[PDB]
């Protein structure tokens, strides 16, 4: 495929800082009461709203790396003080 | 942490996202209120509910259970009202004997209608098997199986 | 021993079939790893 270029553009039908917000989207509009149902001209093809949550776990990884580093140096007697000062500097 | 884990693991078909936070109700004191915020799984547009199949269940109460389960706004609808609808219909069959008559699946979902499909099974094959056990000192019984009884 | 119990707990969170059966049409259950970054450069989609 021809690859696309990531250059900012100028001009447009809008003044800068805005987008075209009366542009027509093929997507239906449901009324609040349905009775004697038939069908929809424009359907909702993707019906579920997909919000599967993942957290960013950088601090847990940093604690585990700190434990591995001072276990490689054969000094785990320093572990509680070093891990405690790192958790204090998180705050 | 364990409240969040227990609430997320108990209702994973309906919610699957809880966030819990605390905030101080007053300065110079450690008293603080805790709030729980749930974002349930949503379904992006359900306007009507229909029930299909079910040739044993008369029309006098299908209308009232379709009327009961209606939401108010059409646009953002939770999954769990789906689980409400079959919780009516299954119960009706479980109130009338009938342990093999159940809501199979929902087949609407593209025209905005939640349409339950009821499956009603019937007897097809009757078979008989002839067995006898054997007396030993073991705790588990072994059997001798015959095609025809003596 | 603790590692083996944690692998069973991980199977219950990640490959749970009551959620797998309804994933085309009622829910969204996809297999991903842990989240590695929060922000990427915009031209990353050129790798596709």
Keywords:
part of a larger assembly; 3 chains; A: 91 residues; mainly alpha; 30% helix; B: 150 residues; alpha+beta; three-stranded mixed beta sheet; two-stranded antiparallel ribbon; 3 helices; Bacterial surface antigen (D15) domain-containing protein (chain B)
- Tally the helices of chain B: 3
Approximate helicity band of chain A = 25-40%
* Helical proportion of chain B, percent range: 10-25%
Oligomer: part of a larger assembly
How would you characterize this protein structure?
- This is part of a larger assembly, with two copies of chain A and one copy of chain B (150 residues).
- The longest helix of chain A is centred in the last third of the chain and has 15 residues, at 58-72.
- The radius of gyration of chain A is 28 Å and the shape is elongated.
- Chain A has helices at residues 58-72, 79-90.
- Chain A has two helices and no strands.
- Chain B is α+β, with helices and mostly antiparallel strands.
- Chain B has three helices and seven strands.
- In chain B, the strands form three sheets. A three-stranded mixed β-sheet of chain B has the order 3-5-4, covered by helices on one side. A two-stranded antiparallel ribbon of chain B has the order 1-2.
- The longest helix of chain B has 15 residues, at 80-94.
- Chains in contact: A-B, A-C, B-C.
- At the A-B interface, loops of A face loops of B.
- Chain A: Belongs to the ycf78 family.
Per-chain topology:
The structure is cut from a larger assembly and holds two copies of chain A and one copy of chain B (150 residues).
Chain A: H1 58-72, H2 79-90
Helix pairs in contact in A: 1-2
Chain B: H1 2-10, E1 18-24, E2 32-38, E3 48-53, H2 59-68, H3 80-94, E4 101-106, E5 113-120, E6 130-133, E7 143-146
Parallel strand pairs in B: 3-5
Antiparallel strand pairs in B: 1-2, 4-5, 6-7
PDB class: translocase
Keywords: Complex, Translocase, Channel
Entry title: Cryo-EM structure of Chlamydomonas TOC-TIC supercomplex
